[PDB]
Structures are given as structure tokens and as C-alpha cells.
Design a protein around this ligand. Structure first.
Ligand SMILES: Nc1nc2c(ncn2[C@@H]2O[C@H](COP(=O)(O)OP(=O)(O)OP(=O)(O)O)[C@@H](O)[C@H]2O)c(=O)[nH]1
Ligand SMILES: Nc1ncnc2c1ncn2[C@@H]1O[C@H](COP(=O)(O)OP(=O)(O)CP(=O)(O)O)[C@@H](O)[C@H]1O
Ligand SMILES: Nc1nc2c(ncn2[C@@H]2O[C@H](COP(=O)(O)OP(=O)(O)O)[C@@H](O)[C@H]2O)c(=O)[nH]1
Ligand SMILES: COc1ccc(/C=C/C(=O)c2ccc(OC)c3c2OC(C)(C)C=C3)cc1N
Ligand SMILES: [Ca+2]
Ligand SMILES: [Mg+2]
Ligand SMILES: [Mg+2]
Lengths: 54, 334, 428, 437
């Protein structure tokens, strides 16, 4: 019903119409997660090359 | 071949619907958690509406309207009325009802108790049934849950011989297109023990519930009067017909209730599709004025009427969406 | 992820292998000379997957030819497309493996394996981005069975992070050379479970039955069998060979088809089924192709898919056809037969349509299915194994090459493990 | 003037990026070779379009964009495409082998080797920025790269540019245009890692876009191009206020203010109207009332869900074309009385309206017809959680049997991360519950 904050210009116009009132991990933490996953890859590859050695 | 799932344990109605669907030889029931269905006969609580109408190559239909709980839960129905301009407090087919929360409208409730005290006229309300205001408030906080305080109909229509009380159940099917179908057969749940006039404390003659009544089966079989026997009684006792005196108001109450919620619940332009069977509970008084008690989301049907109504659901709610490779309902036009 | 290295080992391996290169060279428009002669740029856009660009604009199949017997590899060299193969890539022994897995894996084939790996390495070093390897071989012989699985094991050690793909030919009494074929197959399966990423289970029983019952040929040859093999092999490689709406990839197939690392044995399937030379004139409609490719009559492994459940399916349709009709039919199969697909892997069928049809057929369809019904194939081999092994029969051919009874019990156990593992998900 | 950097990750990100930058060029009158005749301050400037395009002494206008894929095929088509001169090759980054539909391969394995090169190329564009405000990230939920690499990049961008705002444009997976069976896994994994690092996220369900192309554009089987030209229209509508003179949504911080009250619940539903076929011969042009009414039809939404069964927290209406405030207010008045628009008790039942008089631009030859007026409604509704429930259930089916898990564990990821990601999602579902019912 009420039309507030009406701004006009050449490009267009904008407004608000209210009908009713109311009632992060660090760089070191990233590297420690990424490298621990490379450790588990390297362990699995080594265990595979150990099995193939046998 | 069409595919369906059953997810309701208790539903004797949709147990019969699934039975009739398999019997046609074109519907295969799948396991409960199989997502690849045409039809869902879903659960009473927490139905996963958000999952429906998302499987490619399948038209999906469900036996519940989402948001229809706003008409079927006691506290919701009262709020919808005293809110929906389509109805508003200026109602005549509904009784004076109030919502009370246990530790809200208590300022409004006490103002109605005072003005009824002023004229000294009947000040009786319902949940047990009592006359005093503060002797009922102790019951609400004792039980735990939120309950509704409704104006008790002190002068109801009485069946003779017996000097009794009754309530009418109507079965209403709303299809995917939002056609409102009223089933031509209803039922009268009767109290065999004569209705007490002054004493409020009595239990069996005041409430007419099939479960709580079980004098059982004294006048008619299982305290249930069908529509032909009640029409005949009204013709002899009151010189009028069931069609004129009671049924016109019933049709108006059903139509007004579902028209109100249509913008909120209709599946007209949705990815999934809804039908629903409703149970409307009515009350006829001495002056043949019809009152609404409540609406049932998962209604139970009368034992003699199962085979015809469940075939009717298959006919206009299911086979209209899924054709097979006449009308037992009254359409309430809008 | 582009270059695939193809290896063919033994009599069956080289015969189905030669036929594959014969079929796919025609599809990419390559003559026996190695020169391109086709009339479409779409034939060359992914030719780097299986061909190497030669001196003066010629293509050379990236492949390696392996046998312990010089017999079969001479037949390839003198055959129709024999001149296309790089001469250096022919690696042969002399004395043969005499249907002996032990001779293949441990003794005769141990001598030759390092020569093969030098050829593999020379081919792998040329590759811009190596995808992995594909082996064609039977599991009933000595060379393809014994030495094939040895090569696999050695290739895995040198290239631990690449894909292992096999076209493994399963033996059947209906098309049987020696009595010791159930032994060779069981020892080979043990290896494939551990060391391959994807295995197409081409079953000789199924190929025979298709040739006998469906194709109405009374006495089928190996050529009649290998016609069906090459038709399937083309079909299951189409997406890697031609551009599509999905960037098709041997790793992406493994990731999407294999829910559990051991269960990586696929039922290949083809529609329509056709005998050699004799052409069909009525082109099949999209609903007909879809109905056939899922029917057990059209499966390359003699298992009844109704006896099990599909874990994952991949389908490839070839021809000029309505892509919407393909989607509709594929969804109709899944919605009419939803019990035969597992509920616990949502949307477990993927479909592709390629515009280029195979030779002869106007429109065709190829099936790749990871069904639990494949246990029937392994149970069959297991039953034939026990019949002999309960009396230690024919075992002296193996123990004389240094093998022990222990290794046979281990192989039997691991196959029975795989059977009960597939069984676990047919109830889940 | 504050600049915005666009990051496009994976096939879906890159290709949607293509359609968007193609469209931005047609709107601002910028040609394939980067020239702009309408621009008078050659060499630089601080106009509203300069938010997205930087200038060179040659007179070229270069997109403030970086395209990253772990695989050459897609970006090579940018390098050889019709807008090849528009970008300097340093903006276009490609690896050797892709993440093969695997989140863990994109996040941990192939991510680690390329991450430092990407952040360095981002810094190279950030150092051309006199006052950078933040980023727009274009990706898929279901790709290996799209889920894996994006989540890592979002983590790192919170370290290197903590002050700045991040915005997501995400492609929610649909079986109708699927590429992978593990798309539910990838989707839950990425959301968990991205949720705290994303300020506002625009979900585009491929199902909804596919159906709009079928229903309103009469295409039997929509291509990726068909979807991308439609998605870019919606993207353009959302980003228009940053590229054009206006007073609503002038910066990325204002997107958070206007659309995101609760920081976790940051998925506003976009709805667009009208989508009209170009090959359609006779069309009656739709009014302000008609197009606003379409914003409340589920068929026109970017995600199929029912906002009648949920609550609003914020509502933006963004108009392009012949639209005046009088006609808008009259449409809102009529709609409010007919439809179930329920807000949360702690929010004003309001609409923030923005109009740009220049009607939406279409790609010549494309499927979208020229219209006199169009609207994009951005509404933060709790109904979007339906898309979460759908995806979570699909996750639950596979994970119950630990199916495909080995592919992730085999890339160094731990099985515990799956169930950590899933419990975060179940927390999010119940956050929407508290607000919604
Ligand atoms: N709308 C749209 N969706 C796309 C497009 N390309 C892919 N997708 C969707 O994105 C998902 C797969 O993600 P992609 O971007 O193809 O995968 P990627 O990020 O390249 O990751 P990998 O290839 O697995 O390394 C699927 O759900 C596709 O439907 C596109 O151009 N437009
Ligand atoms: N305001 C009122 N005046 C008169 N009688 C009333 C009343 N409210 C309830 N009743 C009686 O009490 C009975 C119970 O109805 P109510 O809806 O309160 O419980 P209920 O929900 O278990 C019945 P149903 O199972 O059919 O929904 C009715 O049969 C009716 O006759
Ligand atoms: N389908 C098919 N099967 C074959 C062919 N040649 C041999 N076999 C089967 O392969 C098994 C013997 O393997 P073979 O390759 O001849 O021995 P190898 O050379 O020592 O490996 C037997 O079970 C045969 O049925 C062939 O050309 N086609
Ligand atoms: C369970 O659903 C799926 C099954 C398979 C895929 C595979 C995607 C591919 O990249 C791919 C790779 C190699 C191929 O040749 C053997 C194929 C292949 O896939 C298609 C459909 C294109 C056909 C064959 C994906 C999903 N989701
Ligand atoms: Ca300038
Ligand atoms: Mg032989
Ligand atoms: Mg990719």
C-alpha cells in the first residue's frame, strides 16, 4: 500500500512497497586436510605395491 | 500397466482401494520405497510431498491434498474460519469456538462467558462437558495438548422412539481438477441411551462416537442409520424431506469450506497431482439447522458402503488420470 | 584421457582382436594400407583413442600382438587387415602354452612377458594422456588365460593409476577344446577380480546358443561366434570412438558402473542379432531395439537377467533416430520392470545415441549391464571345477609346472566369494 | 565503482559462462573483438558496466572472468570460439585429465596440483581492481570438477579475500540431463564444504529449465545450448543492477541484505516470465499484471517447489522493459488478495522493486522472442528445501549400502566425511523447518 524509497534515473526506477509490518578455516588447516588425504593415497598405493611384490 | 505404492498401515479405505486396483489386472503394486510409481497412497503423518512429480516419464498422483490439514485439525479449522473472509466470525453454520493453549484467545473467551451469564441462558461448552468456565480450564492444562472450547448444542434434534442424539457423516471426494463430489449415501451415528436434559456429567448419551459407544445396536444395526430410513422418518415425524431440511445446508457447508482453501491447496498447475477423500461431521438441531463439527483427513467408511465408495474413488479420482485400456456422487458446482 | 593401449593374447584373443580392428577401421574409414578414405570428419575427431598417427598421414592401431605360439600370429599377419599393424608390435614365443594356465602364468609365459612390456612402454611413452589398457583373451586356454592375467598383473605394477579393461571369453562344454578349461577359467577369474577395473564377460555358451537357436545355424564355427563378438566390441567402444553429448571415458565408465570394486563384470548385449553375410531388410523400430537388447536371447553372457537385479545399466543406440523416442522407451522399460533394477541406486540407466550406424545394420543397440545374474556364469564354472578338483583330476599338468593344490583352493574360494557377494545384493 | 570477478568451474560453469558473457556483450553493445562504439572514455573509466568489463589502451573491453576446467575439451571451444579475442588466454585455465564424476578426485587429487595456479591468475585480475567487492562462482553440483574443485576454491577465497563477498550460481542435478550416477553424492559433499563460504546462492534445477524449454519454447529434446541461453537470461536479470545505473542491488553486499536474513538459509528462488518462442508466429504481448502473476506459478520457477507451503523472508521483483510503478503496485494489490503469500512473523510483507526501461536482449536466431516487458522475481522462500529433501533421500539410498563410496575413499577422502556432510544437510533441512512451519 505504502510506496517508500523511490529513486528515479534515466535507466529506470526502483522502490520498496510494504504491505504489512512485522510481529572459516585457515591456510594451514586447508593444507593439513589436503596432505592427510595424500598420505592415505600413498599408503594405499604402497600396500598395493607390497601385495604385488609378494 | 500402471504402478502404485501403499504407505498407510491402518487405512481400511485404501486397503480396499489397492485391492480393487490389483483386481482390474492393470495395476501392479510395488514395494514401499520404490520411487518409480504412478500413484501414491501415502502415510498419515509426514508425507514426502516434495518428492512427488519429479520422476521423468511418469505422471504422479497422490491421495492427499497438501495443506488440507488446515481444515482437518481442530485448532486450524477454528482459526481458518475466524480468519478466512470467505467465512469470518459472521458464520451461522459453525458454532462459537475458541483455542486455548496450556502453559491464544482467553480475553475473547471470557467476554462470551460474561454476556451469556447476563441473560442467564445456556452456558454449556465442550472439549469432558461442563457448564462452569474455570472448572474446564484445569482439564486443558492436565492433558498437555492444545484443545478447542466449542459451544455445546443444548437443544439437538431427537430421534423417536428413544429421545436420542445423532451426528451425520458425509463423504466428500475432491479430484485432481478440484471437482467437489458428495457421496449420495451418508450415515447417522446414534446414541441408544436417551439424551439427558439437565445433567451435563453423563457420557454415553452426549457423545455419539462409534468407538466410545461400544444398549449397543438397539434400534438399528450397529448404531448406524442409512439415508433412506432417515428420509422416511423425517417425512412422517416432521412432514419434510432429507433433501430439503438437512442436505441443502450440508452441501453449502462443504462447498464453502473447500472453496476457501482452493487457492492454497489446488494442484491445477503443479508437477504432481492430488485427490482426497474427506469426512465431514454434522449436527442437526431442533429447528432443523445444520452445524459443522469437524473435517476428517483420513476418514473411516461405514461397513456396508465400502464396496461402492471405493469403486467410486477408482472411477473418478484414479481412472480419470489413468484410463483403462456411472456417477454415484453429487457434483457441487462452483 | 584419450589414448587406449590394446593388447591381444593367445588364439582367441588374437582372433577376436583382429576382427575388432577389422570392424572399427571400416567405421573410421581406414583401409588395410593405413590411409584414410572415409567421407566424414566425425570419423577422425577421436581417432587418437585407438589409432596412432603415422608417417606421412597414415594411422596405426596402437596395439600389441601376443602369443606363446607363432601359429595364430602368422594368420593375423597374412589376413585382410594384417598389414596395418606395426611390425615391432608382434611379440611371439615358440613352444606354445598347450592349454595350460601354469605354462602361461609361471613358466613359458614368464620368459616372454618382459618383451611384451617393452612394447607396452614404447606405446605408452608416445601417449599424450593415457587412459588405460584393453585386453582381448579367452580364460580357457594357456596363453590368453595364463599369460594374459600375468601381463595384467605386471601392467598394474608399472601403471597403478590407469584403467584395466578386458574382453574375456568364458569357456563352455558346448564349444570346448580341453577338459581343463574350468581350471584355467577359475584361476583367471581370481586374477580379474583383483586386478581389472572392467570386464566384459563374453560367454561361449551364450554365443553358441544365439548362433544355434536365434540365428538358426545348426553347426556354428568360431567365425560365426566371432561375428557376434566383434559386433558387440564395436558397440561397447562406440562412445570412446565417436563424439557424443557426454565426454565418454574408461574411468567415467568404471566410476558410474561399479558400486563395489569387486563387482565389475558386465553382461554385454546386442540388438539386432544377425548371422554372417545374410542381410536383414526390415530396419528395427526404437521400441523393438529396446525390447530385444534387454531380452535374455540377446545377452552375450548365458545368464537370465530375471534371475537377478541390475545394479547399473549403460545403453548405446546407433543410427538416425528420434532421441525422445529413445528416452521414452528406456524409461518405459525401467517403469514396467522396476523390480529388476535396484531401488538403492537411483537413475541407474544411462543412454547415449550415436548417429553413425555399424556396417549393414541401419539402426542398432548395444547393452552394458552390471547385473547380479552374472553369478550364474561363475557358478557354472565353479560346478565344473569341483567335479574334477574333488578327485584332483588332470592336476598333474599344473603341479608339474610348480603349482600347488593350495592355489587352486584359493582360486575356488575367491570365485565362490564373488558369487555370494553378487548374491548379497540380489536380496538387498 | 566496485568490480566483480566471475569464476566459471567445470563444463557447466564454463558453458553457462559462455552464454552469459555473450549476452552481457549484446546488452552493453560490445562486439566479438572487444570493441564498444558507445564508450567515449577510451582506455578506462568507472561506469556501472566497468564492474564486469575492464578496459585497455587499445579500446578493448575485457571480461573480469576466469574460466577453469580440469579438462581441455570445453575451454578449447572458448579459445577457438566466436568470442576468442574478448579474453586474454591467461584467463582460460585447463588441466590434462578431469575429475571423472568424482568429488574427491576434484577436491583432493587433481585439485591440489592446479589450485595455486588458479588463485595466482585470480590475483592477477584482482590487482587490476581499484576496489574489488567480490566474486560470482558458476558451477555444477554434480560434476567432479564442479563440486570438487569449486569447494576447494571457495575455501581458499575466504582466506585470500576474507573481506569480499562470494555468490554462487549452481546447477542442481536432474535425471533428464544427468551425466553421472553419483551426482547426489557430489551435491551433498560440495554444499557442506561451500555453505559457510557462500554469501548468497542461486540454484538452477536443470529439470525446471528442461521443462520450460519443452513447454514454452516448443523444443522436443532441449540441448545444453537451449538451457544455457535461458539460464543466462535469468543470470543477466540478477546481475543487471550491478552493470546498470540504479539504486536497488547496487553491490553484492546488498544482495545479502535484501535476500539473506539468516546466513545459512541463503538460497533464494528465482522465477522468470515471460519465456516466449521466437518461432511462434502470433503472440499477444503480456502486461505488467500478467507477468507478475506468472512469478507465483511453479512452472516458471528455476526450481520446482510450492511456495504456498512455506514462508517468505524477502521478495525482489526485477523488471526489464516498459514498466511503471503504478502498474506494478496495482498488480501486487490484485495478487495478494488471490494467492497464499505467507511471510515469517519477524519480516515485513514487502516487495523491493527494480525497473530498467531497456527491455531484455535476445541472441539473434535463438529460441527466445523479443518481449516489451519481462520480470525476474527473487524470493527467499523456505519452499526451496523441497530440492534439499529430494537430493538427501537419493543420497540416503546409495549411502545405506555404501555404494560407490570406495571411489571417494580411494582418492584419500575418509568415509566419515560423507556422514558429516549428510548431518550438516539434515541440520539445514531442520533450519528451514523452524523458519517455515
Ligand atoms: N544447464 C547446464 N547443465 C550442465 C551443462 N553441462 C553439464 N551440465 C550438468 O552438470 C552436471 C555434470 O557436471 P559437469 O559440469 O558436466 O562436470 P565437470 O564439472 O566438468 O566435472 P568432471 O567432468 O566430472 O570433472 C550434470 O548434472 C549435467 O546435467 C550445461 O552446459 N548447462
Ligand atoms: N458443540 C457441540 N454440540 C453438540 N454436540 C457436540 C459438539 N461438539 C461435539 N459434539 C458431539 O461429540 C461427538 C464427537 O465429535 P468430535 O469431533 O468432538 O470428536 P471426534 O473427532 O473423535 C469425532 P470423528 O472421529 O467423527 O472426527 C460428536 O458425535 C458430536 O455429536
Ligand atoms: N569365441 C571364441 N572362442 C575361442 C576362439 N578360439 C578359442 N576359443 C576358446 O578359447 C579357449 C581356448 O583358448 P585359446 O585362445 O585357443 O588358447 P591360448 O591361445 O593358449 O590362450 C576355448 O575355451 C575355446 O572355446 C575364437 O576364435 N572365438
Ligand atoms: C549408472 O548410470 C551411468 C552408467 C554409465 C555412465 C558412463 C558414462 C561414460 O562416460 C561412458 C564411458 C564409456 C562408454 O563406453 C563403454 C560409455 C559411457 O556412457 C554412455 C552412456 C555414453 C555409453 C557408454 C554414466 C552413468 N550415469
Ligand atoms: Ca570507459
Ligand atoms: Mg587353442
Ligand atoms: Mg568435465
Amino acid at each position: 500500500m505504502e510506496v517508500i524509497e523511490l529513486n528515479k534515473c534515466t535507466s529506470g526506477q526502483s522502490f520498496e512497497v510494504i504491505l504489512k509490518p512485522p510481529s572459516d578455516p585457515s591456510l594451514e588447516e586447508i593444507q593439513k586436510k589436503l596432505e592427510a588425504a595424500e598420505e592415505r593415497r600413498k599408503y594405499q598405493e604402497a600396500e598395493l605395491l607390497k601385495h604385488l611384490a609378494e | 500397466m500402471y504402478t502404485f505404492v501403499v504407505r498407510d498401515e491402518n487405512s481400511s479405505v485404501y486397503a480396499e482401494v489397492s485391492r480393487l486396483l490389483l483386481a482390474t489386472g492393470q495395476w501392479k503394486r510395488l514395494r514401499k520405497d520404490n520411487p518409480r510409481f504412478n500413484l501414491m497412497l501415502g502415510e498419515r503423518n509426514r508425507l514426502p510431498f516434495g518428492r512427488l512429480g519429479h520422476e521423468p516419464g511418469l505422471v504422479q498422483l497422490v491421495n492427499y491434498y497438501r495443506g488440507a490439514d488446515k481444515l482437518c485439525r481442530k485448532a486450524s479449522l477454528v482459526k481458518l474460519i475466524k480468519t478466512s473472509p470467505e467465512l469470518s466470525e459472521s458464520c451461522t453454520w459453525f458454532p462459537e469456538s475458541y483455542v486455548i493453549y496450556p502453559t491464544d484467545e482467553r480475553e475473547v473467551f471470557l467476554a462470551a462467558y460474561n454476556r451469556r451469564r447476563e441473560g442467564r441462558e445456556g452456558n454449556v461448552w465442550i472439549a469432558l462437558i461442563s457448564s462452569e468456565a474455570s472448572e474446564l480450564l484445569d482439564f486443558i492444562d492436565e492433558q498437555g495438548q492444545v484443545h478447542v472450547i466449542q459451544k455445546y448444542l443444548e437443544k439437538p434434534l431427537l430421534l423417536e422412539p428413544g429421545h436420542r442424539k445423532f451426528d451425520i457423516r458425509s463423504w466428500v471426494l475432491v479430484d485432481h481438477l478440484y471437482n467437489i463430489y458428495l457421496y449420495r449415501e451418508g450415515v447417522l451415528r446414534t446414541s441408544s441411551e436417551p439424551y439427558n436434559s439437565a445433567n451435563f456429567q453423563d457420557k454415553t448419551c452426549h457423545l455419539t462416537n462409534h468407538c466410545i459407544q461400544k444398549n449397543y445396536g438397539r434400534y438399528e444395526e450397529g448404531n448406524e442409520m442409512f439415508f433412506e430410513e432417515f428420509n422416511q422418518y423425517l417425512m412422517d415425524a416432521l412432514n419434510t424431506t432429507l433433501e430439503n431440511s438437512i442436505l441443502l445446508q450440508i452441501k453449502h457447508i462443504i462447498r464453502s469450506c473447500l472453496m476457501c482453501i482452493e487457492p492454497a491447496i489446488s494442484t491445477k498447475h503443479l508437477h504432481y497431482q492430488s485427490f482426497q477423500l474427506f469426512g465431514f461431521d454434522f449436527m442437526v438441531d431442533e429447528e432443523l439447522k445444520v452445524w459443522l463439527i469437524e473435517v476428517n483427513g483420513a476418514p473411516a467408511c461405514a461397513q456396508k458402503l465400502y464396496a461402492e465408495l471405493c469403486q467410486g474413488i477408482v472411477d473418478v479420482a484414479i481412472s480419470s488420470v489413468f484410463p483403462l485400456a456411472t456417477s454415484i456422487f453429487i457434483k457441487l458446482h462452483h | 584421457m584419450r589414448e587406449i593401449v590394446h593388447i591381444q593374447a593367445g588364439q582367441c584373443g588374437n582372433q577376436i582382436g583382429a576382427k575388432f580392428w577389422e570392424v572399427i577401421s571400416d567405421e573410421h574409414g581406414i583401409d588395410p594400407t593405413g590411409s584414410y578414405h572415409g567421407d566424414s570428419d566425425l570419423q577422425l575427431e577421436r581417432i587418437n583413442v585407438y589409432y596412432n598417427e603415422a608417417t606421412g598421414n597414415k594411422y596405426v592401431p596402437r596395439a600389441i600382438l601376443v602369443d606363446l605360439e607363432p601359429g595364430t600370429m602368422d594368420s593375423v599377419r597374412s589376413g585382410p587387415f594384417g598389414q596395418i599393424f606395426r611390425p615391432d608390435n608382434f611379440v611371439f614365443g615358440q613352444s606354445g602354452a598347450g592349454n595350460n594356465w601354469a605354462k602361461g602364468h609361471y613358466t613359458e609365459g614368464a620368459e616372454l612377458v618382459d618383451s611384451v612390456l617393452d612394447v607396452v612402454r614404447k606405446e605408452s611413452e608416445s601417449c599424450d594422456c593415457l587412459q588405460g589398457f584393453q585386453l582381448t583373451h579367452s580364460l580357457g586356454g594357456g596363453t590368453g588365460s595364463g599369460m594374459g592375467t600375468l601381463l595384467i598383473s605386471k601392467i598394474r605394477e608399472e601403471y597403478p593409476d590407469r584403467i584395466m579393461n578386458t574382453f574375456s571369453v568364458m569357456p563352455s562344454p558346448k564349444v570346448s577344446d580341453t577338459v581343463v578349461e574350468p581350471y584355467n577359467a577359475t584361476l583367471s577369474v581370481h586374477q580379474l577380480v583383483e586386478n581389472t577395473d572392467e570386464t566384459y564377460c563374453i560367454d561361449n555358451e551364450a554365443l553358441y546358443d544365439i548362433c544355434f537357436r536365434t540365428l538358426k545355424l545348426t553347426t556354428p564355427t568360431y567365425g560365426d561366434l566371432n561375428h557376434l563378438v566383434s559386433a558387440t566390441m564395436s558397440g561397447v567402444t562406440t562412445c570412446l570412438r565417436f563424439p557424443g553429448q557426454l565426454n565418454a571415458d574408461l574411468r567415467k565408465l568404471a566410476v558410474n558402473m561399479v558400486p563395489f570394486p569387486r563387482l565389475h563384470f558386465f553382461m554385454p548385449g546386442f540388438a539386432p542379432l544377425t548371422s554372417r553375410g545374410s542381410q536383414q531388410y526390415r530396419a528395427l523400430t526404437v521400441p523393438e531395439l529396446t525390447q530385444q537388447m534387454f531380452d535374455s536371447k540377446n545377452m552375450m553372457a548365458a545368464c537370465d537377467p530375471r534371475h537377478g537385479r541390475y545394479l547399473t545399466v549403460a545403453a548405446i543406440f546407433r543410427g538416425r533416430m528420434s532421441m525422445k523416442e529413445v528416452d521414452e522407451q528406456m524409461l518405459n522399460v525401467q517403469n514396467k520392470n522396476s523390480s529388476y533394477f535396484v531401488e538403492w541406486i537411483p537413475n541407474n540407466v544411462k543412454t547415449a545415441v550415436c548417429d553413425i550406424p555399424p556396417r549393414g545394420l541401419k539402426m542398432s543397440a548395444t547393452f552394458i549391464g552390471n547385473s547380479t545374474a552374472i553369478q550364474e556364469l561363475f557358478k557354472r564354472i565353479s560346478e565344473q571345477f569341483t567335479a574334477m578338483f574333488r578327485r584332483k583330476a588332470f592336476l598333474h599338468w599344473y603341479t608339474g609346472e610348480g603349482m600347488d593344490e593350495m592355489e587352486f583352493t584359493e582360486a575356488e574360494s575367491n570365485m565362490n566369494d564373488l558369487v555370494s557377494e553378487y548374491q548379497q545384493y540380489q536380496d538387498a | 565503482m566496485r568490480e566483480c570477478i566471475s569464476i566459471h568451474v567445470g563444463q557447466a560453469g564454463v558453458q553457462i559462462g559462455n552464454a552469459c558473457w555473450e549476452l552481457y556483450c549484446l546488452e552493453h553493445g560490445i562486439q566479438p573483438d572487444g570493441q564498444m562504439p558507445s564508450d567515449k572514455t577510451i582506455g578506462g573509466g568507472d561506469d556501472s558496466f566497468n564492474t564486469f568489463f575492464s578496459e585497455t589502451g587499445a579500446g578493448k573491453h575485457v571480461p573480469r572472468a576466469v574460466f577453469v576446467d580440469l579438462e581441455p575439451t570445453v575451454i578449447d571451444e572458448v579459445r577457438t570460439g566466436t568470442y576468442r579475442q574478448l579474453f586474454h588466454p591467461e584467463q582460460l585455465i585447463t588441466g590434462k585429465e578431469d575429475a571423472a564424476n568424482n568429488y574427491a578426485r576434484g577436491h583432493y587429487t587433481i585439485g591440489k596440483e592446479i589450485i595455486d595456479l588458479v588463485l595466482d591468475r585470480i590475483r592477477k585480475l584482482a590487482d587490476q581492481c581499484t576496489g574489488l567487492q567480490g566474486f560470482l562462482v558458476f558451477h555444477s553440483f554434480g560434476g567432479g570438477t564442479g563440486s570438487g574443485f569449486t569447494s576447494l576454491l571457495m575455501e581458499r577465497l575466504s582466506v585470500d579475500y576474507g573481506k569480499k563477498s562470494k555468490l554462487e550460481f549452481s546447477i542442481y542435478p536432474a535425471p533428464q540431463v544427468s551425466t553421472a550416477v553419483v551426482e547426489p553424492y557430489n551435491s551433498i559433499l560440495t554444499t557442506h564444504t561451500t555453505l559457510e563460504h557462500s554469501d548468497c546462492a542461486f540454484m538452477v534445477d536443470n529439470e525446471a529449465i528442461y521443462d520450460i524449454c519443452r513447454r514454452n519454447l516448443d523444443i522436443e529434446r532441449p540441448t545444453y545450448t537451449n538451457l544455457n541461453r535461458l539460464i543466462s537470461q535469468i543470470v543477466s536479470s540478477i546481475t543487471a543492477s550491478l552493470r546498470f545505473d540504479g539504486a536497488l542491488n547496487v553491490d553484492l553486499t546488498e544482495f545479502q541484505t535484501n535476500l539473506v536474513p539468516y546466513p545459512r538459509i541463503h538460497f533464494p528462488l528465482a522465477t522468470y516470465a515471460p519465456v516466449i518462442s521466437a518461432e511462434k508466429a502470433y503472440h499477444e504481448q503480456l502486461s505488467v499484471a500478467e507477468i507478475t502473476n506468472a512469478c507465483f506459478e511453479p512452472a516458471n520457477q528455476m526450481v520446482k517447489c510450492d511456495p504456498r507451503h512455506g514462508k517468505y523472508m524477502a521478495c525482489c521483483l526485477l523488471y526489464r522493459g516498459d514498466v511503471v510503478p503504478k502498474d506494478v503496485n496495482a498488480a501486487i494489490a490484485t495478487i495478494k488478495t488471490k494467492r497464499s503469500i505467507q511471510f515469517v512473523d519477524w519480516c515485513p510483507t514487502g516487495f523491493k522493486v527494480g525497473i530498467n526501461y531497456q527491455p531484455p536482449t535476445v541472441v539473434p536466431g535463438g529460441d527466445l522472442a523479443k518481449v516489451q516487458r519481462a520480470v525476474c522475481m527473487l524470493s527467499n522462500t523456505t519452499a526451496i528445501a523441497e530440492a534439499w529433501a529430494r537430493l538427501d533421500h537419493k543420497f540416503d539410498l546409495m549411502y545405506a549400502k555404501r555404494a560407490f563410496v570406495h571411489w571417494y575413499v580411494g582418492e584419500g577422502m575418509e568415509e566419515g566425511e560423507f556422514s558429516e556432510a549428510r548431518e550438516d544437510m539434515a541440520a539445514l533441512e531442520k533450519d528451514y523447518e523452524e523458519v517455515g512451519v
